[PDB]
Enzyme design. Sequence first.
Site, short mmCIF file in Angstrom:
data_model
loop_
_atom_site.label_atom_id
_atom_site.label_comp_id
_atom_site.label_asym_id
_atom_site.label_seq_id
_atom_site.Cartn_x
_atom_site.Cartn_y
_atom_site.Cartn_z
N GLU C 52 0.84 -1.23 0.00
CA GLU C 52 0.00 0.00 0.00
C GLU C 52 0.86 1.26 0.00
O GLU C 52 1.80 1.37 0.75
CB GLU C 52 -0.93 -0.02 1.22
CG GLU C 52 -1.98 1.05 1.20
CD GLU C 52 -3.06 0.86 2.27
OE1 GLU C 52 -2.90 0.01 3.18
OE2 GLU C 52 -4.06 1.62 2.19
N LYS C 121 -8.34 2.91 -3.51
CA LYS C 121 -8.85 2.11 -2.40
C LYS C 121 -10.28 2.54 -2.18
O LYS C 121 -10.61 3.69 -2.39
CB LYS C 121 -8.04 2.47 -1.16
CG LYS C 121 -8.51 1.87 0.15
CD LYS C 121 -7.29 1.80 1.06
CE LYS C 121 -7.63 1.44 2.51
NZ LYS C 121 -6.45 1.18 3.37
N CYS C 176 -5.86 -3.17 0.79
CA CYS C 176 -5.97 -3.42 2.21
C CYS C 176 -7.40 -3.61 2.70
O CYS C 176 -7.98 -4.66 2.53
CB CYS C 176 -5.31 -2.30 3.02
SG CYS C 176 -4.97 -2.81 4.73
N1 LIG Z 1 -10.17 -3.82 10.26
C1 LIG Z 1 -8.85 -4.22 10.81
C2 LIG Z 1 -7.74 -3.81 9.84
C3 LIG Z 1 -6.63 -4.84 9.62
C4 LIG Z 1 -5.67 -4.37 8.54
O1 LIG Z 1 -5.93 -3.27 7.98
O2 LIG Z 1 -4.67 -5.08 8.24
C5 LIG Z 1 -8.61 -3.68 12.25
O3 LIG Z 1 -9.21 -4.14 13.24
O4 LIG Z 1 -7.81 -2.77 12.55
#
Ligand SMILES: N[C@@H](CCC(=O)O)C(=O)O
Lengths: 339, 649, 339
Positions: C52, C121, C176
């Site tokens: 990213e 994204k 991501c």
């Molecule tokens: N949604 C995830 C993100 C994980 C990631 O972006 O690798 C979190 O709890 O932060």
Amino acid sequence: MNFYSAYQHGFVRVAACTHHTTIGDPAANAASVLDMARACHDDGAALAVFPELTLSGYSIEDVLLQDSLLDAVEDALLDLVTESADLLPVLVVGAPLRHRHRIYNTAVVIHRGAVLGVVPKSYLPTYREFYERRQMAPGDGERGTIRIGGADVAFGTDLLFAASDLPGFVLHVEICEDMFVPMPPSAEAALAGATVLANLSGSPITIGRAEDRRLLARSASARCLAAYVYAAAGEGESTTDLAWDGQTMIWENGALLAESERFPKGVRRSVADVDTELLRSERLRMGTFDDNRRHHRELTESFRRIDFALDPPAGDIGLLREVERFPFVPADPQRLQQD
Amino acid sequence: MNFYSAYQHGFVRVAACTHHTTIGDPAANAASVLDMARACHDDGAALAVFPELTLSGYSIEDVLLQDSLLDAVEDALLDLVTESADLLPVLVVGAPLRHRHRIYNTAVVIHRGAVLGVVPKSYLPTYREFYERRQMAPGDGERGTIRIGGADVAFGTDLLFAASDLPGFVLHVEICEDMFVPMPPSAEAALAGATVLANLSGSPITIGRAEDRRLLARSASARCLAAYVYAAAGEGESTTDLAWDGQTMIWENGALLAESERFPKGVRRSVADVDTELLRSERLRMGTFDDNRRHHRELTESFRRIDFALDPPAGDIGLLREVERFPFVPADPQRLQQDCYEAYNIQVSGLEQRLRALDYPKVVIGVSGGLDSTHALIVATHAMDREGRPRSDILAFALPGFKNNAIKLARALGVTFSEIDIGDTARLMLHTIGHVTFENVQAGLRTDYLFRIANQRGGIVLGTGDLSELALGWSTYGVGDQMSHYNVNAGVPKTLIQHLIRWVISAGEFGEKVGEVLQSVLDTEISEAKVGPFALQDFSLFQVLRYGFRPSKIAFLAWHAWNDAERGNWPPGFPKSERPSYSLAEIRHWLQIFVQRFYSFSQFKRSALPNGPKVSHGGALSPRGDWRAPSDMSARIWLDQIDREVPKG
Amino acid sequence: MNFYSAYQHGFVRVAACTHHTTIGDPAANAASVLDMARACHDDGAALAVFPELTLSGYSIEDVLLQDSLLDAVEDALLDLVTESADLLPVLVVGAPLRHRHRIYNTAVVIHRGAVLGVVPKSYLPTYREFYERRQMAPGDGERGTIRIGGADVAFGTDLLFAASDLPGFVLHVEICEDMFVPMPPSAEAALAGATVLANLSGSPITIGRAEDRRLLARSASARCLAAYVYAAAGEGESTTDLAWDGQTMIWENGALLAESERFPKGVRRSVADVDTELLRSERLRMGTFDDNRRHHRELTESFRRIDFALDPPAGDIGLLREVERFPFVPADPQRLQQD
Ligand SMILES: N[C@@H](CCC(=O)O)C(=O)O
Ligand SMILES: NC(=O)c1ccc[n+]([C@@H]2O[C@H](COP(=O)([O-])OP(=O)(O)OC[C@H]3O[C@@H](n4cnc5c(N)ncnc54)[C@H](O)[C@@H]3O)[C@@H](O)[C@H]2O)c1
Ligand SMILES: Nc1ncnc2c1ncn2[C@@H]1O[C@H](COP(=O)(O)O)[C@@H](O)[C@H]1O
Ligand SMILES: N[C@@H](CCC(=O)O)C(=O)O
Ligand SMILES: N[C@@H](CCC(=O)O)C(=O)O
């Protein structure tokens, strides 16, 4: 007839209030709100607008996400609603509220014991000193209803609150940043029939910002042939990174009807009698305004109109308005020199 | 309030059942279902999911098209619905049902004497061992109503069943293959507000299939911030060409709440208490989840919401849920080893980058022989090793005021060691201001000296305060141990620190002499008199920091995890002499101290925090990352919530 | 025929790379990228995915908004594109890019001297340790083109890159967080025809997160009957508040083809031969997959398909794939015990 009654002559008395914030203590905020609203009632006001996120405090950041804080905000809101059974004005109180998946930055429109509507902020600034998208969801395009104290009440950016016994008075509500984007919700609202545009603001203060607020509230009130009623947060908000000035103001078609002391010690109100006939007349004459509406017909016919009966006081309550003796001769020397 | 009621704390009890299939005999199947449902009722369950095509048997092929079979299915379904008047849970029962031209593979949602809805399977596998399209029609895109026992009830893929008296519980139902396609009905349902996703499965068993089911049920529950409740067919299905394993399971946001014996003899249930507040909290926080909904607004606003009143039991019905004692320290040794490996590497790599950026300053650290600085010294050393830096560039200092482990560790690692008595400077300073102030003068002068040495000798000062100390404001702010150039321990809670040190010993990388000293530091070291036992405060910290749970909910969870030392599991390394149990009275007590210190007192100390890496999924306390909060707020409402909601003992 | 050619047997060789981040130094990042891409070329890879925001570093916060940073990002991108004239693989490189009003968090798909497309994204995390909405705009629903080095190139979430001389290889790209929401862009892309799903990740590391990444890449590759190629940021990202682990991995229909050392010293690549015929066969057989597509016909027919000619190597380049001797008898004792 009662000839000395401002209401009988098409005025509607409105208040923009700045209360005492106690961050993270909704009972305390509600108590300050209730006390201010009772003042407004005593003044025969029809409308009382409070600062953004009144019941929680605007500045509490991730504390907005705490169950206990959200629970306490609900509890306090329901107490206000119950107290409002005895209050004349429509109250517009800020509150972080759960809906669907998230909490919305909302303004709760309360009247005579009921919630008329809940309006979510549309544009949540997430830049410079603002982090709103972190805690709260955008309101733009939300419709439907929200469940508040065992009733389903209209929820969304498309609401109008119209006094059935006072047709010059049609309320629309937006929140802070909403009036700063190229196409504010309030501008569609005015084409749809809103005459009094409320704005609940948090608005930490910086050099030059009070001017920015004026520029945008004044221009809105002029371009939309409307009253604009504005209330910002003050004493009590966190000064972890910001200061607050408590500014309140009320505009009408480009003219300042009232404003309050900046950086006050204690709570302040701006109270003024808005001339709904003045707005009526300006609009009757400026056909290009209705032309704008017809051009955005789809946008403007989709507003939901919630009715309420104000039943304002019939007697002599004075006139909270500066009526100049010489409509053609401004009393202010600088203004007169210019003319 | 009833404090011991799981329901009053936002739990909803759900069951996935595998009954005894009698193929082609709906009365028998309904009898098995009825008997299982009565069990679920007795357990106070709100929901009971059964296998695909429960009432007929999944595996009967063209027998599904026989009038007598379809007629018997209807008759049995109507008896179930009638029996359900007296049952607490919502029943989700499979049934081949006639609608319009065809039979649909349906799930019938039944509650307190009525059918709430009928949900057809969307995707009918017709490949390999599956021939579903031959007998049954696809449901995707069917809406409207279906006529069941003289009532018209909602029919379609778009249904949500919402508990009016329990808003955390919004049910969506799909069927087997539905969860296996790129864009499952359940994913749209979650965006629309479904929190509990049921799946009725037939699913003949083959090598590796149970993993496939897990993979997809687990990932669904995680991606959709939901409970996923799954029930497959078992004993009784035809073994003409297939075998059946009866697997049931219940997932919650990626975690396994419960599962049952594969290939059981007899019927089996998975029953677990799902935390609807947990789901609420995750969703409140992950805005990209609501963003996804708004992007599929048309899809998600078109769901029909059917309301029902659950009226769950108000009393103590236990808690069918494993609440671990140490949210930050996994009891499973394999999982714990993994977390330690990760914490350590996070700490090290965080520091390696700061050092690279500063072109490799000397590392200045106050070593007192306590857990935190011991661990930081180890982290520092490893970082220097990995970057090919001489250990002699680490400058360890003992700073006696008014322990041997520290010099022993330093000599064993071979870093540069030195003592500086600060007592005289302290005496001078105390006299000069004419004398907490006494503890603080020393604590401050330690930091002052370290900083000045760092200027002098071309270093940075390494912080050593851990997360639990950040949480409670247990540090001296500014001039004091709160302050440093880089804090490798800032993200590590105290409860985890001891396990990282063991982890370091057990790996053995620093040699037998170093390991002995580290072991000694552990043995020796293992303020909790004033701020409470860290096991409890680390527990509350996780709840608050990750979910923002209200105090009474935290008290309930902690009491279930901690009140009985014989129940539940202990991570490795708790000799049965250091395995306390806590009363409600204590848990309440420390929680009052916690909310007051966490929400009110301590934030200003976190507000001006030096740099250092996030470690735990529970969160870290950086005002630049996980925790943005006011430095000037009272904790009144949390204190009041405890007064109101948590019993005195 | 060339019988020993992996490409002649329906394999496509893909790489997930983690480079050396130099925060705020696009020229340095590009130089690392260029050097890794040349390696991939030498390996006969068709595809090389990077982390990213590769060209700027993911972790630079408001430095993303600095003109000089954005300008340097563009210059560096154009040098990559020029160097790519001589490179075999399609490069997928991360870059903060200006479009209309904002900077988008994008993945630039580069091939043989040209930019095939730019993919923003879709979902920008703004919660916990993530502040993306502060600096960057969401991509969901953006379409049209973006002007990159004097050419207009497809821009949007709806793009497929299809190898004209290798039809089993149809690339879709997401970024991501995109794979973490209930309905990921990649899932629609697979129904539309994408067979190889790239993910550029930043993904600061925390306890348990590597599992989360696996859970979600593995399930996606299984539910979408696809290869899933994933690359996260590592050494060089800021450790102001976070650490980074450099994880790279390649999945195929639920199976792990390849993964790299976590917390490596230096750069790492996962390189594996993906069997496009395996994906073809699974899809040919699971009609419910095509059923899902038809049900989301509007969603799925609206993808834009950008063609390129890969012209892979024809000779013996080995087979970077673990082919078990006994398809029915797993070599791993634990797995065999289970079966
Ligand atoms: N949604 C995830 C993100 C994980 C990631 O972006 O690798 C979190 O709890 O932060
Ligand atoms: N184990 C450890 O890590 C450790 C180390 C040192 C001390 N301690 C313990 O903690 C204590 C440290 O004492 P303390 O926390 O009172 O000392 P402190 O100086 O860190 O905290 C109080 C100081 O900050 C000011 N302050 C308080 N609230 C503020 C706010 N909201 N905004 C700005 N300034 C604010 C106070 O007026 C005072 O000057 C010791 O007495 C000891 O028992 C623990
Ligand atoms: N006697 C000491 N010698 C050297 N460093 C110390 C000493 N006491 C405290 N420190 C440092 O200050 C930190 C705070 O410890 P404490 O205040 O004792 O909990 C320790 O982790 C050390 O880094
Ligand atoms: N958009 C304004 C905000 C002004 C306000 O919220 O009052 C700014 O950042 O300057
Ligand atoms: N389509 C899936 C179905 C698995 C199941 O029904 O459990 C498969 O073939 O494996």
